[PDB]
Design an enzyme around this catalytic site. Structure first.
Site, PDB file in Angstrom:
ATOM      1  CE1 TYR A 126      -3.976   2.210   0.712  1.00 42.24           C
ATOM      2  CE2 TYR A 126      -4.643  -0.105   0.434  1.00 42.24           C
ATOM      3  CZ  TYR A 126      -4.955   1.237   0.435  1.00 42.24           C
ATOM      4  OH  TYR A 126      -6.250   1.612   0.113  1.00 42.24           O
ATOM      5  CG  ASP A 149      -8.472  -0.830   1.414  1.00 38.95           C
ATOM      6  OD1 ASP A 149      -9.390  -0.067   1.658  1.00 38.95           O
ATOM      7  OD2 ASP A 149      -8.217  -1.200   0.275  1.00 38.95           O
TER       8      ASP A 149
END
Ligand SMILES: NC(=O)c1ccc[n+]([C@@H]2O[C@H](COP(=O)([O-])OP(=O)(O)OC[C@H]3O[C@@H](n4cnc5c(N)ncnc54)[C@H](O)[C@@H]3O)[C@@H](O)[C@H]2O)c1
Ligand SMILES: NC(=O)c1ccc[n+]([C@@H]2O[C@H](COP(=O)([O-])OP(=O)(O)OC[C@H]3O[C@@H](n4cnc5c(N)ncnc54)[C@H](O)[C@@H]3O)[C@@H](O)[C@H]2O)c1
EC number: 1.1.1.42
Lengths: 414, 414
Positions: free
Chosen positions: A158, A305
């Site tokens: 990420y 997420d």
């Protein structure tokens, strides 16, 4: 240059790792793109009513608008999507909140949300997910979900480290990997994009430390380390190992039965907090099938997420899910949904997410009575079925409310 | 050395990319660890009854046991977890099936499932997920899910390329990244594990090519490219771009409205197949909230793992979810659940997964009448509520069946 510091108002300071919040604190807010124009005014009004009611006029926030996204390019010029000033202002005033943000496509710009997190080293992405009675949900028992996600917010894939297929840089990396590192498992080395997934011991232990301190301070039942460590042994697997190690090293974790779970005694209530772990794909099944067995979750960035989004969907809370990005020095609370440009400016959007992120902000500021009034208001308004279109369109017998009117319903229910 | 080739029986061959299956084909099967000892005999009996009934004694499979996992170490010795012979035997006989497998911990051995996929270049992991009426499900409308997952099975972070924190190799990689590639975004470079995520154009286009050919051959409505391309632009984002490119280059994809979705005309039914894309975290919400809008899914390896598992959980099919690993030359069908060592040998486990993977195997062999009889049998037995404990314990009014008895119920319902 274009921010106006409030005339009346004082700066929050950090002393001995504890926030010193004046009765008149200046709080930066970013309106947000799209429906930010709808949900931020509703949030300003709801927070001010909760503060007014809780402290009877003795406390008041001096809101100060600062800029990121579209409105920043309209305030500061052409490709000013995140002015340096905005990072300095969050650093200076310590606590801030923002509406949804979208990053432009086509200009090589990486996520403005992730840039704020990484540059302010807000290594905790904190997403509490529970069910609000009256919320239309796709699952049969949403009330069994009451979880708090501690998603590592500074590392993982990420983080944006990658090179494009056929670029000189991706070829250089692939040549190093095959030739110097002896990698044989890149199936097709030509026309191949490459990403790097880092996960450190220090990054892992400060996130799991925050999760276990949270389970202690809130007398939660367990902390589940979610990882895909049977495939990614040295990033996901190492996150899991370092999380258990931290629990043993700093919280006196003791082995349950033959392991691997540990029990940490809550210093304040004597409750034995279970430290356990679940592999991430099985966990996406378990949150649906056995939701009551989970509570505080500690996981890496990408899995966090996914988990937060899947949980928010299951409780019907995709547009009312609160979130915070917290580090050791600074904190940025946020609407967690998209910009919804299709309804922006129509005073239709659900302000529930940014309002519950503001409740999280007030609680982080030590203003727990005002935070409690916002939870009570959201409780009552949703239970009353006086809700915005995204809820009402999925149900019978609801009273449809504009975004601004639902902000009023929350105040009415305080 | 310890495999017995069937006396009667003939080898499937591949001619002009099409399987030539004898009426008496030899099929390799791996029993599987744990409950493999329960579900594989039930699968052998169910498949043989479907073949007997469909072709009236004219066709018959010559099953040949081959070895991987625990049983391999018991057949071949101490650390023979995946003998070379087993890969040669799947290659030679082309089509095979296996029960669940677990990889040992503590010996540095990587996933035996992934080793089979990668070494046999079975780049399609195919997971059809639909609801069987009568199945206890956590969601309100499981019947709206009818999806087919094409998960890329040879690349991604799922490929096993990584180095351990503090090893000489991880330090060497991090030094190259910071010093030669100019990487500044590794938050903590010390005591840091490193993984590599590759995604190639050729790997992407052969997986999306298979997904679009599947939507054509089965007259499905759409193919959704699921990716996390707004953060991982050059692996996930590039997968998405190459998937749309392939649809335009080879299937005459035309733009719908102002894009980005395309329409591909089905050559055989004239149906306009929609090619679209959804970001992966939003997709984990959409499969719950708008499941009827999705059909064929094409995605990378890790997201495919997560998506398949989340979908199987939502339809109540965590123990009856079929799967196949298909390449251009070979194919390995598989039980998709774990080894469940807690109930192994108790004739309790649900054989539904490996039986539906056997239905997928028979359909891949062109024996669609026998495949149709197994689907019909699973249909009827589950609708009859004559099911194994994992279903029965979640419901009222079911007749509890042993693993072997549920295999009989499926035959009874053909
Ligand atoms: O692409 P996006 O994520 O910006 O929006 C997706 C869909 O969800 C809706 N949406 C997102 N947040 C919402 C909110 N808070 N209230 C109402 N609708 C919302 C949008 O209108 C859109 O239809
Ligand atoms: O760790 P695992 O994935 O091997 O098993 C997890 C749990 O699911 C159960 N399980 C897995 N597959 C099953 C099947 N096919 N039938 C019945 N139960 C099953 C196991 O018994 C266990 O309780």
């Amino acid at each position: 240059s274009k921010v106006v510091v409030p005339a009346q108002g004082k700066k929050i300071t950090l002393q001995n790792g504890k926030l010193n919040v004046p009765e008149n604190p200046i709080i930066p807010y970013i309106e947000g793109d799209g429906i930010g124009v709808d949900v931020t005014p509703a949030m300003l009004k709801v927070v001010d009513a909760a503060v007014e009611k809780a402290y009877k006029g003795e406390r008041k926030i001096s809101w100060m608008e600062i800029y990121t996204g579209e409105k920043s390019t309209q305030v500061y010029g052409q490709d000013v999507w995140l002015p340096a000033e905005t990072l300095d202002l969050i650093r200076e005033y310590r606590v801030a909140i923002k509406g949804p943000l979208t990053t432009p496509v086509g200009g090589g710009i990486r996520s403005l949300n992730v840039a704020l997190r990484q540059e302010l080293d807000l290594y905790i992405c904190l997403r509490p997910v529970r069910y609000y009675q009256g919320t239309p949900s796709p699952v049969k028992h949403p009330e069994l979900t009451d979880m708090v996600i501690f998603r590592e917010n500074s590392e993982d894939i990420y983080a944006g480290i990658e090179w494009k297929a056929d670029s000189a840089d991706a070829e250089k990396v692939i040549k190093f990997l095959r030739e110097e590192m002896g990698v044989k498992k890149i199936r097709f080395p030509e026309h191949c994009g490459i990403g790097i997934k880092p996960m450190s011991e220090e990054g892992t232990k400060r996130l799991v430390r925050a999760a276990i301190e949270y389970a202690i301070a809130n007398d939660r039942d367990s902390v589940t380390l979610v990882h895909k460590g049977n495939i990614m042994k040295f990033t996901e697997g190492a996150f899991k190992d370092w999380g258990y190690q931290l629990a043993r090293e700093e919280f006196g974790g003791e082995l349950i039965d033959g392991g691997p779970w540990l029990k940490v005694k809550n210093p304040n209530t004597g409750k034995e907090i279970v430290i356990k772990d679940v592999i991430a794909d099985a966990f996406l099944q378990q949150i649906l099938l056995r939701p009551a067995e989970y509570d505080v979750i500690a996981c890496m960035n990408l899995n966090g997420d996914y988990i937060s989004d899947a949980l928010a969907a299951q409780v019907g809370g995709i547009g009312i899910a609160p979130g915070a990005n917290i580090g050791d020095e600074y904190a940025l609370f946020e609407a967690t949904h998209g910009t919804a440009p299709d309804i922006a400016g129509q005073d239709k959007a659900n302000p529930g997410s940014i309002i519950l992120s503001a409740e999280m902000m007030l609680r982080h500021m030590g203003w727990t009575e005002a935070a409690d009034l916002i939870v009570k208001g959201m409780e009552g308004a949703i239970n009353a079925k006086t809700v915005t279109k995204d809820f009402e369109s999925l149900m019978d017998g609801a009273k449809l409310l504009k975004c601004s009117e639902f902000g009023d319903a929350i105040i009415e229910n305080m």
